[PDB]
Amino acid sequence: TRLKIVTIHQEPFVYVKPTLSDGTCKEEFTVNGDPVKKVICTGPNDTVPQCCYGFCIDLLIKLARTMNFTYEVHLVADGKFGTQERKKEWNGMMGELLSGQADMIVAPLTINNERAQYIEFSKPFKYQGLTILVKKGTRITGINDPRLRNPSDKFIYATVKQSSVDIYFRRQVELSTMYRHMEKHNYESAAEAIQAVRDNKLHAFIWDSAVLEFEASQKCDLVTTGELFFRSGFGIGMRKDSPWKQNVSLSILKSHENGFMEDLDKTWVRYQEC
């Protein structure tokens, strides 16, 4: 049985590029000489084949080899991570897992309570926090800043629509006007919001620290500010009683102990130049 793997565009965990003329992927190599491994993902580009690669595709490839299965990677239809909205239905990668469109989510998918009620998560492959991406020289103290708590058109802030960050701000935050403001401004994808911070369309992007710290490392105009809230993991997503549960988690724990995960960090995440 071929596992339908679903994923999403999210650097540096998943890079998405167009194929060449002949339908292959461009032969790239890391600075240390090793081949960069890529797969033919299908999905929307504004269904046609594209080249997928990164932290999470290297991980997919590991698990494939260890558990001996075949995969067909596809990009989530709506371009979302997945929330549950009013009959309350799950969207994004979460919706696709449950409805059968996917067999496995391989992505920087945040492990939380809500989602774990409906799917199985592997043991975390990474552990990380929330932070705020801003222009260099924009001191944010924390969650309770004046410009946030008392919002305005002079200082716009946002997150990505239909992530666990979004529904938590809508449904759960102890603050009225913040979600009213944020609902006006939230972005469809993380790449768009990161670019908006650069082009001054957005003054603060609330998002995964693993993505934003990587982004700030490569962009000297951008800094992160805050360890907001608490830490949470990324894990593989599966249906609650699929027979892969045990071995996916065994593989990830083995990957942490034999240094394979540390290597994925060195290849894709750990970077500095500013």
Ligand X SMILES: CCc1ccccc1-c1cccc2c1CC(C(=O)NC[C@@H](N)C(=O)O)N2
Q: Per the annotation, does 164 bind a ligand?
A: yes
Check residue 90 for interaction with a copy of itself (CB under 8 A): no
Binding mask 203-232 for a copy of itself (x = CB under 8 A): ---------------------------xxx
Dig out the tokens for 159 from the structure: 């997150």
Spatial separation of the C-alpha atoms in residues 238 and 104, rounded to whole Å? 5
Partner from ligand X, a copy of itself, none binding residue 110, C-beta < 5-8 Å depending on class: ligand X
In terms of CB distance, is 25 or 91 closer to ligand X?
A: 91
Spatial separation of the C-alpha atoms in residues 23 and 187, rounded to whole Å? 31
Residue in the structure block whose two tokens are 């409906």: 118
Dig out the tokens for 165 from the structure: 């960050």
Size of the site for a copy of itself (CB under 8 A): 22
Closest by Cα among 133, 162, 110 to 228: 133
In terms of CB distance, is 151 or 237 closer to a copy of itself?
A: 237
Q: Where are the alpha helices (DSSP H) in 150-205?
A: 164-167, 176-185, 190-198
In terms of CB distance, is 30 or 258 closer to ligand X?
A: 258
Q: Per the annotation, does 208 bind a ligand?
A: yes
Spatial separation of the C-alpha atoms in residues 86 and 74, rounded to whole Å? 26
Are the C-beta atoms of residues 107 and 236 closer than 8 Å to each other?
Answer: no
Candidates 15-23, 88-96, 139-147, 248-256; binding stretch for a copy of itself (CB under 8 A): 248-256
- The reply to whether omega before 49 is within 30° of 0 (cis) is no
Q: What is the DSSP letter of 236?
A: -
Q: 162: number of CA atoms within 13 Å, CB side? A: 20
Contact residue for a copy of itself among 111, 132, 202, 236 (CB under 8 A) = 111
In terms of CB distance, is 147 or 254 closer to a copy of itself?
A: 254
Q: Output the smallest distance, CB 29 to ligand X, in A.
A: 29
Q: Which residues lie across from 239 on neighbouring strands?
A: 119
Closest by Cα among 221, 191, 220 to 208: 191
Check residue 253 for interaction with a copy of itself (CB under 8 A): yes
Q: Output the smallest distance, CB 52 to a copy of itself, in A.
A: 27
Q: Per the annotation, does 110 bind a ligand?
A: yes
By CB under 8 A, what part of segment 113-142 binds a copy of itself? 113, 116-117, 121, 123-124, 127
Partner from ligand X, a copy of itself, none binding residue 163, C-beta < 5-8 Å depending on class: ligand X
Partner from ligand X, a copy of itself, none binding residue 261, C-beta < 5-8 Å depending on class: a copy of itself
Check residue 257 for interaction with a copy of itself (CB under 8 A): yes
Candidates 49-57, 142-150, 152-160, 253-261; binding stretch for a copy of itself (CB under 8 A): 253-261
Closest by Cα among 119, 147, 171 to 225: 147
Q: At residue 14, what are phi and psi to the nearest 5 degrees?
A: -135, 115
Residues that bind a copy of itself (CB under 8 A): 111-113, 116-117, 121, 123-124, 127, 230-233, 249-250, 253-254, 256-257, 259, 261-262
